């Protein structure tokens, strides 16, 4: 079904992560977003995008 | 069991 | 692990509440290694509690009854 | 091409009629479009559910040059 599951991991120490999908087959660039990290309790940067 | 009663 | 009532403790005979004593007075269980005293029931005679975790309540209750709580 | 299908009914409709006294947050209508629009003290959720925002009595109105149905919540 093409679209593929990926995790966004917290740029902070905290091993926290969010979880989503993407069309690797067209948007191969890793995915970087600002998301709230509830361990540091601060909007930090999230990375990786499988 | 063999058609007519009782052949 | 067991819990003890203020209502007990005035019934160990030998105003000193500790594991083997409660046990003797048949209120906890021969194999209990740990016991707490809860704020349940009233406490009347003063009494001494040795080696037993004690809730805030129970402490007030016991201390008001002129008793001591020596961990 | 072979029929036979249909989908579970969605229990859409009016949940509280005019005059009904509701507590805040209470759904007044499950609708699909906005047959009714949120008026005073009435909210509009995603599916276009209209809900109450204050405790009061469900009022139905027709307001405006478009003549649109509105649901509001007056204090009792």
């Amino acid at each position: 079904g093409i679209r593929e599951k990926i995790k966004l991991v917290s740029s902070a120490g905290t091993g926290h992560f969010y979880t989503t999908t993407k069309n690797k087959r067209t948007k191969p660039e890793k995915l970087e977003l600002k998301k709230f990290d509830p361990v540091v309790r601060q909007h930090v940067i999230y990375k990786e995008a499988k | 069991x063999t058609x007519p009663f009782x052949x | 692990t067991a819990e003890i009532r203020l209502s007990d403790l005035a019934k160990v005979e030998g105003g000193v509440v500790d594991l083997n004593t409660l046990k003797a007075a048949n209120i906890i269980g021969i194999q209990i290694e740990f016991a707490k005293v809860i704020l349940a029931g009233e406490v009347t005679t003063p009494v001494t509690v040795r080696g037993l975790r004690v809730t805030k309540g129970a402490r007030a209750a016991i201390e008001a009854a002129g008793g001591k709580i020596e961990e | 091409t072979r029929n036979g299908r249909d989908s579970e009914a969605k229990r859409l409709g009016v949940k509280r009629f005019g005059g009904e006294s509701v507590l805040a947050g209470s759904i007044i209508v499950r609708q699909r479009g906005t047959k009714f629009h949120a008026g005073a003290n009435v909210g509009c959720g995603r599916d276009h559910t209209l809900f109450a925002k204050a405790d009061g009595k469900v009022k139905f109105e027709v307001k405006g040059p478009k003549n649109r149905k509105f649901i509001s919540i007056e204090a009792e």
């Binding site: 599951k5 979880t19 989503t20 999908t21 | - | - | -």
Partner: protein, 64 residues
Amino acid sequence: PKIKTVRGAAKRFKKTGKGGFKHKHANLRHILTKKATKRKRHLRPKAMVSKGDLGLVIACLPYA
């Protein structure tokens, strides 16, 4: 002979203060990514067994 406990029930239901049963929600085990954060959040806390199910639960736990 003692009634025997449906041992799988005893791994899923716990009897509480007023005599009811708490139990874990269903749907937080996997296939998580698509489920709304809201949805999952209200599934975390435990819940009471329904009126219509106490018959069944209780049948499975004589010694609860």
